[PDB]
Structure 1
Amino acid sequence: STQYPVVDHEFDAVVVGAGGAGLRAAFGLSEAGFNTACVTKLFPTRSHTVAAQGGINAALGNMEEDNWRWHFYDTVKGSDWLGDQDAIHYMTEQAPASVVELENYGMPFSRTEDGKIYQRAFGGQSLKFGKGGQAHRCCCVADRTGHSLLHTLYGRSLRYDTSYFVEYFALDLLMENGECRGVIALCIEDGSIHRIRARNTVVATGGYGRTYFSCTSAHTSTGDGTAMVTRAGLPCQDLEFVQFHPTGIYGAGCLITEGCRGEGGILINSQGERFMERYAPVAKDLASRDVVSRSMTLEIREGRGCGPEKDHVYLQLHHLPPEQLAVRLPGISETAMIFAGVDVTKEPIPVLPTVHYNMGGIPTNYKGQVLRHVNGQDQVVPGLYACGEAACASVHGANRLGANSLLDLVVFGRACALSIAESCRPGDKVPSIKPNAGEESVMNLDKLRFANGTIRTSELRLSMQKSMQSHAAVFRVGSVLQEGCEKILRLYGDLQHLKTFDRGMVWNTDLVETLELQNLMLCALQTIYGAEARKESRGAHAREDFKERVDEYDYSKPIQGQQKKPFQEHWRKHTLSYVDVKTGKVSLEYRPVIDKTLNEADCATVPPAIRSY
């Protein structure tokens, strides 16, 4: 009803998100001459990327000599061969240019004796295609590189006539016969509802780590764009692939950077024995995030846990020089003292694996375009793009590399812009939605605003969070996942018993957090059903009933005299997850991963192998 005033807007392009991904897309579209809106539920600078610390990968070769193709090999390997190689070529080749793009904007990178950008070692990175030892290509601004990445882009963004909708909350896509026409949004300030319409729509809403009880991510990481793609009956991809960062702080779960381990910091069990020497003799505590995280967890279950409760590990830095901790790691020094009372220079940080990054999300081309799945084949969704943690081009595959998401952001925000600037022209027929479009998003809004049920928003949130934490952690088993599943499906049913207290139009955060819950649940459902269906161990998804990496071949031996497994008989394939919103039923399907690169001649396909560090 028109209790809610509808206000119609008309743009060439909309970007939903104002993190690095969001910003780079927004002002990239404007630079290209497109009259561009940007919808964000937070003042741009508040977005999660400020929290980023360790750095941004790029083979500038500032410390030693490097090759982007080396970064390529590292990433596909990192991804455990669930990584779409075409997107990983595009990204790694672009990587130097994207980081020079930032520094030339004014990013205050830490420096070397040469005056070039300082880069450091990071988890999972090598020279000469895995054979040449440790690589140093993580570009950084001390251990606060996300903060200044975001503020420099934000700074830049002010040079263009991009229309910003600050503290507006996107509810759904404006969808018409499979084509995306824009977004419908609640203006938090005055409760008003706004249809922003455009030829092209970019979703850059980041991840959904808040599905968990313990996560390094912000309170605002509630998978809201992932949620929107879903209610449009579009698939999400690889949602069960949830990265646990090895070194989250014991108390408040706040991130302590991989940079620590990259700068010489050590992981230690209660015996004092540097245990990563045991699990990965070559890479040690500079191995993959899925492996290090998995090795940490196993040291706990086996009684080598630290502290009174025996439930954590130790990140020793105190052996490094104070002046190195001061210059390289002033941020973590600060927050380890604030949250744990720990002096990094005297005592070790208490650390524990904690949910960090969603490598799953909205499937796309390497060009940024959202894919749907028709008759087991890829189909580009007209007018819909996605980038950053929200998306899934699967450049990260089964396990993200450290300092690759900040890269992901700047490369694919740029890509969505170019794809638009190359496929149409500013001023073109902005397609017209029905006068009654986005009707149901309002009805939903109204039912949630006046909700007088049995269960408060926050109580159902914690229910979901602790259920996801106990049933979909580091290691999972069939039975635990199964109990986990119906438990989440029960909680989806419990949504109809929701209670809201706030009746106001202005800043009804009670209400937005409820819309957020609706979003978190759809991300939860898909993460858990998809997880229970995948009967293998690959990357972050470790099954204790299926320890094997199940490919088309047994890739340990040469593949010659061997039968290639049919598509529906193996697991080297992306999960495509759907949900019927009316009953919360999860349907699931699969598409192949892209193995060929953009050019074999310039960048050779790395076939699957037994992957260890």
Structure 2
Amino acid sequence: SNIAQYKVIDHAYDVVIIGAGGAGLRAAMGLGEAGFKTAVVTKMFPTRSHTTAAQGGINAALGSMNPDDWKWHFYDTVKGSDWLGDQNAMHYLTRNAVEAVTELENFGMPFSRTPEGKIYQRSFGGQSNNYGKGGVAKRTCCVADRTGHSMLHTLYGNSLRCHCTFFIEYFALDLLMDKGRCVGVIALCLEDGTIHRFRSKRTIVATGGYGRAYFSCTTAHMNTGDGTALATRAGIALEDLEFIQFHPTGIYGVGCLITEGSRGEGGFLVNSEGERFMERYAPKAKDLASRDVVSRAETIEIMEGRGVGPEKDHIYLQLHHLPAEQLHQRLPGISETAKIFAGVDVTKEPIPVIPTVHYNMGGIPTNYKAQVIKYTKEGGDKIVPGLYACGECACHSVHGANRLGANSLLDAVVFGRACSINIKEELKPDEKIPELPEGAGEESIANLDAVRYANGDVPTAELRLTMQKTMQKHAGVFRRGDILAEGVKKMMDLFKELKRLKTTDRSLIWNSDLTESLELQNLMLNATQTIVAAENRKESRGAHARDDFPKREDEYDYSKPIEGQTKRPFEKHWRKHTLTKQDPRTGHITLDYRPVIDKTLDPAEVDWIPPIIRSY
């Protein structure tokens, strides 16, 4: 903190949440309800978080449209993960799914309804009845086309009833670490330019994804992976970063998402030939195949010169064959969005769409209870005391290598609640609030000041613009070992240009130049780890495809019958979680690998699901 003076302020809370998305709030609700003194720190008003921009819906086996079993949901969830998913956490999720979504309706979430008067459910990608044998599932509860908006707004409202004290437009800077324990967060209040340390027994990280690490995405400008960057700086290894989910129907010019719900109602993809081509790549499920399957399908038709439009470089989503009544009642939002950005009447023309960055199944590794973890070969799973994390920013890991549609809002509400429950019970009123080590947060402030005043020779927008461009080119839908290798190279050079950084706005008060530059460090951490972790994965699993390694490498070969083979060693196959660990200052990364938890929570309640061939 050489070249300036900084007011600092100390607080003392039971638990400090960093996030006001679905996860964050839902956690905070639980904690206040159970009489904790909770702080919620968020860099924007909670209504502005990305959750609000979710459209499709939230999965629960309610049987409001046809009889359903949460075990068939559990089935589809694991299949979707591509057996990288830790089945215990997938178990917890799907089991508690029906309760979680009913809680929402009871909180006053205005769900769409049936003639019987129950929650309306729509079809959605990747899901099916009777363990893959039945038809196309219908358990995706929705508020038409605006399900996240409605969930967040409902959640936010109910958080005002339960005495959480909100610290809004506070940019969290770093975790407060006391030799392996989390005692709080340090943050910059944008309103008045002060610096705030929060002391707390627990800390929940709930900070969303890092979609702005790519040139095109569906995500918000705030999605800059600050939480994973927080954990990286605190010496915690991140997990599964190389699995970046490409949503198939993002709008061509702009990025704005068109829901999968548009296909779950009946809409479909169409190439230049006018073929409804998904019937080739997935005869059974067609346009409701898993996202990664569909996104690749599109990305091929483009490469094979059957792309649509002037450049022949995107695809059409066709919706005008549906009734107009149904387009208003089920998809009013995107009806409008397509009108605004693409200049399209969805009842009369198709929307130009193209695979687009969307979700991060990677994140901060945790257990099923949501306690952030560390891993060594010998010691194994080692929790980080005081620290929890949930939602997009986490890696429980319930999505393995491919997120099931309508499972993030669930993950957020389930494991958000799980943080509150799993804290109400390990934290007891004997334990007092930790004191801060001297010099706590001093280096966060040193970094702040250095960035604020920095006078390099490359501006903060330019360095970002290429980081994003490099990622779009080298780490996209189909990847090759040489392209990735060059990617890592180019990427590691941009990590060095971070010393040559140039800012202009010198102010403490609401400096959006300074904060977009803290975001850019946070992206670079997340970005570099994403591309090396990817360059090393020499297989093809879920939302990660190598041209040069097109097969799924598991313990056995699950294409032939089992008995007869020898289980390959852990070091040879790839059914395991990538664990990147980075040095924040030098930018050097190292790898390590973690076994997939295949057992369920309770053998009685449901059996584990052993890997099979993944075809839709």
Q: TM-score, normalised by structure 1?
A: 0.99
* 8 Å CA contact retained: 1:12, 1:427: no
Consecutive unaligned residues in structure 1, runs of 5 or more: none
1:86-122 per-residue CA deviation (whole Å, 9 max, x = no partner) reads 0001000000000000000010000001110000100
Whether 2:355 is the aligned partner of 1:388: answer no
- Between the aligned partners of 1:462 and 1:495, the Cα distance in structure 2 is 13
Is 2:259 the partner of 1:257?
Answer: yes
For 2:574, the equivalent position in structure 1 comes to 571
Q: Secondary structure at the match of 1:395?
A: coil
- Report the Cα distance in structure 2 between the residues aligned to 1:151 and 1:426, rounded to whole angstroms: 32
Post-superposition CA distance 1:95-150 (Å, at most 9, x none): 00000000000100000011100001000010000000101000000010000000
Letter in 2 for 1:166: I
AA in 2 matched with 1:161: H
Equivalent residue for 2:403?
A: 400
| Contact 1:573 1:592 survives alignment (8 Å) | yes
**RMSD of aligned alpha carbons:** 0.8
Counterpart for residue 590 of structure 1: 593
Q: Which residue of 1 is the match for residue 333 of structure 2? A: 331
Could you say which residue in structure 2 is the equivalent of 1:310? 312
For 1:75-154, list aligned pairs within 5 A.
75-154=77-156
2:225 match: 223
**Is residue 36 from structure 1 mapped to residue 52 from structure 2 by the alignment?**
no
CA contact (8 A) 1:36 1:163 kept: yes
SS in 1 for 2:221: coil
Structure 2: tracts of 5 or more residues without a match: none
Q: Within 2, Cα distance between the matches of 1:427 and 1:333? A: 55
Q: Which amino acid aligns with 1:287?
A: A
Tell whether the 8 Å contact from 1:33 to 1:426 is kept in structure 2 after alignment: no
Residue 494 (str. 1) matches residue 506 (str. 2): no
> Which string of whole-angstrom CA distances, capped at 9 and with x for unpartnered residues, describes residues 401-445 of structure 1?
100000000000000111110101247311111131011100000
For 1:197, the equivalent position in structure 2 comes to 199
Shift of 1:553: 0.3
After TM superposition, list the pairs within 5 Å mapping 1:538-549 onto structure 2.
538-549=541-552
Q: Tell me, in whole angstroms, the C-alpha distance in 2 between the residues paired with 1:406 and 1:197.
A: 29
Letter in 2 for 1:175: M
2:303 aligns with 301
Task: Name the % identity.
Answer: 71
Instruction: Read off the aligned partner of 1:394 and give its amino acid letter.
Output: S
- Give the counterpart of 1:553 among 534, 547, 556: 556
Q: Aligned to 2:5, which of 3, 6, 16?
A: 3
Which of 239, 242, 250 lines up with 2:241 in the alignment? 239
Which amino acid is 2:570 matched to?
A: F
Aligned residue number for residue 450 of structure 1: 453
- Partner of residue 475, structure 1: 478
Deviation at 1:601, TM superposition (A): 1.6
Question: Deviation per CA, 1:486-507, whole angstroms, max 9, x where unpaired?
Answer: 1110000000000000011110
**CA–CA separation in structure 2 for the residues paired with 1:501 and 1:310:** 42
Contact preservation (8 Å) 1:107, 1:149: yes
Give the letter for the 1:46 counterpart.
R
Aligned mates of 1:311, 1:578 — CA distance in 2: 37
Q: 1:29: Cα distance to partner?
A: 0.9
- Alpha-carbon distance in 2 for matches of 1:601, 1:179: 36
Alignment partner, residue 532 of structure 1:
535
Q: What residue is the counterpart of 2:467 in the other structure?
A: 464
Report SS of the residue matched to 1:158: helix
SS in 1 for 2:177: strand
CA–CA separation in structure 2 for the residues paired with 1:509 and 1:577: 30
Measure the CA separation in 1 of the matches of 2:163 and 2:608.
42
The answer to whether the 8 A contact 1:12-1:428 is kept is no
Q: CA deviation at 1:214?
A: 0.2
Spell out structure 1 runs of 4+ moving beyond 2 A.
425-428
Amino acid at match of 1:438: G
| 2:170 maps to amino acid | Y
Letter in 2 for 1:474: V
Give the distance between the partners of 1:582 and 1:95, measured in 2 at CA: 41
| Structure 1 residue 160, shift from structure 2 partner | 1.4
Distance 1:70 1:603 in 2: 11
Shift of 1:180: 0.5
Q: CA deviation at 1:191?
A: 1.1
Q: 1:526-582 CA distances to partner (integer Å, 9 max, x unpaired)?
A: 100000000000001100110010000001112111110111111000011011112
Amino acid at match of 1:275: F
Task: List per-residue Cα deviations over 1:53-72 (Å, max 9, x = no partner).
Answer: 00000001110000000000
Aligned partners of 1:34 and 1:426 also within 8 Å: no
- From 417, 420, 438, the counterpart of 2:420: 417
CA distance in 2, matches of 1:438, 1:368: 25
Structure 1 segment 358-397 matched on structure 2, within 5 A: 358-376=360-378, 377-397=380-400
Query: What is the distance in 2 between the residues matched to 1:477 and 1:69?
Result: 37
Greater displacement, 422-431 / 564-573: 422-431
TM-score, normalised by the number of residues in structure 2: 0.99
Letter in 2 for 1:529: V
The alignment partner of 1:389 has SS state of coil
- State how many pairs are aligned: 613
